[PDB]
Subunit: 152 residues, 6 copies
């Protein structure tokens, strides 16, 4: 298992597609332990047409979504390594989300960095927690539990 993955690799693992694939690159990854990835934030995103007119703010719920997708990548690869064929038959689902706190608004030009740690894992059930950071500062925190389920 490598520690750096690019969008081409992410596309082979996550089922999310435009406009809900919110992870552009993975900078570090340790199986069963953690992942660090990020998503570039640019004004050229449809979401900003409505959030908000003349005041582009990246939706906090999307930051959370981005952290979850990062965790899902971590969970899957921790169990099957980089296996596109098996990834195509699995799907990660949100079970719970807790202790979410938004500290600083994310805006175009920002590099939204995800830092997720594995708090507990048993089979298909994974509990991760961490933060979203921009230039070293914590812009958000969250905890969530997800399940790796059958796509069919």
């Amino acid at each position: 298992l490598q520690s750096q993955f690019f969008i081409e690799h992410i596309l082979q693992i996550l089922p999310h597609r435009y406009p809900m694939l919110l992870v552009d690159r993975i900078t570090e990854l340790q199986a069963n332990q953690k992942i660090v990835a990020y998503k570039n934030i640019t004004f050229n995103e449809d979401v900003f047409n409505g959030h908000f007119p003349n005041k582009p703010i990246f939706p906090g719920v999307l930051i959370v979504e981005g952290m979850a997708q990062s965790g899902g990548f971590l969970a899957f690869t921790s169990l099957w390594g980089f296996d596109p064929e098996i990834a195509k038959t699995k799907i990660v689902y949100f079970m719970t989300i807790d202790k979410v706190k938004f500290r600083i608004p994310v805006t175009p030009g920002d590099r939204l960095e995800y830092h997720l740690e594995v708090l507990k894992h048993k089979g298909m059930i994974w509990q991760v927690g961490g933060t979203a950071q921009v230039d070293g500062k914590v812009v958000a925190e969250a905890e969530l539990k997800a399940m790796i389920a059958e796509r069919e």
Copy 2:
């Protein structure tokens, strides 16, 4: 007590494709709100969530509850006032106790049921559930703060 999309557009700053509340059916000031958003396949999000399997994002369900809550907090204090609305902004500080029980898909009428757990000054804590045909599909608690637009 009932507000249609045109009323909603005058209170909330959210616009396409992030305005996730279509109509308000019930509203008791300082108390509660019941509103909903129709889910249809003809929504852009379904192009990627997911291909060949349309499922309304759980985080967007939470977003819809937040918008309902902010509408509740705002109108409780100032009523239906478009003018004042433009001078205030309701952003969310925290979200907790979120649980997803059932997937939401095209054809569903996603109903938001939020109540005021507590409030002090401009800090408002709301909580409740998201329902589809009488069943709880999600639950969450959120804390918002009302401030002056920049």
Copy 3:
């Protein structure tokens, strides 16, 4: 009932022109009752019209045509995703359509279509679109199913 997943297996229409979310009633060579949810979160409303969201009358008719198409596909070959994937649908004629009430975000647009006549791939249906029990529009139409 037939849900979006099933509708997708029969109708060739896709985003942003798939305007039927669920099929509630189906009677081969007789009639069909289906619907589409209308929400503000649809791109069409950016232009129809700004600050005044009104689902386009022509799209209501389109939705009725699609509902009629599903009835045609299934009356002809039953629920067969394999045959469906080779066909598409063409509008042939539209007539006697009248709009009575504007459809807007938050409405459940219900299609009610019955077959007036059919032969081969050519199907003629007519009926109404309803919101909460009221007729918001009436229309008759004829469409042709064909090989891609």
Copy 4:
């Protein structure tokens, strides 16, 4: 007064993206007729779903384009070219009849609308005509629309 471009169209019709289906007006006779057109390109969002690997301009949108052409005719015949008055107007479809599609419209076609006023009284205009591509009739249609103040 007889030829208008997209700038002029945007100042009269209330429709906007992705529902403004008239690009240019080539000839206009007050209270009588109008000829306009819309270019059809693959680079339009409707083609993502109508259909996949077979782009066909929706018949219902051709009608919409004809109605919009009639709407422009109706408005200017009423108040002349007055953007300030047009700003707060809307256009509702009332009826559609005798429409027949003969030839599919595809990317690369110049969809030309030819509308003639069949009857009009106040805000209610009843127009009828055809949609053409390269001089051939691809569609026929009759429709009645009402111009209304945004209230």
Copy 5:
């Protein structure tokens, strides 16, 4: 063939919405020149931001369209209308030169691309020409590309 429609273009070029900027090919002389076009309509997403109340087809997209035309020419010159082989090739555009915009392009215009092979040495193709609206030259440019395995 000499005339190709959108369904033919889709099988040769990898570009898809919103970056397929060639609607039809009207003329094609293997290794010599190509004449094709793209209709410009207000119903295109790019006009939402370029520019509000002043729809002007981006000059850079006119060049992109000219580049796509050159690519189709190069490819068809090498293998003809072969959808299967098309899936295994890519045309990287290396440079762009001598571009000049003389007249703005707007909704309602039929943007016609006129390109001819300037030089072909190995995997390198050099094309140049103009874009025209109703007989008038609206833009001109030179471009060089390299053919390679996808």
Copy 6:
């Protein structure tokens, strides 16, 4: 006149809007001399749906467009400073483009940095040239001339 401008400032000067506003932040600016700005590249951009399927590559022509907008921002603030009032009475027109080279493909996760200097300028006619960089490497080179004109 300051040297750093964020998206809300760019919105008040450039007339470009979604999906054609392709500068996110200004990091350095010297009036009538040069400018350094950048646009974050993310998978969550509509353009990637067609360029290309299963292989996101930011269009070379859009990179040039981005450099042009940066130039236009420098040009305008050079003649009128940060003036939103006069900014809304103008648009920019591409006149020519020359010496364009595409050396490295740009992909999601990249921070596309624009480096432009003024080659010549008189009245509303500005001629700039420079590079587009990612992690300090030259991804593209270009020269272009633009004109600021009255919206009329």
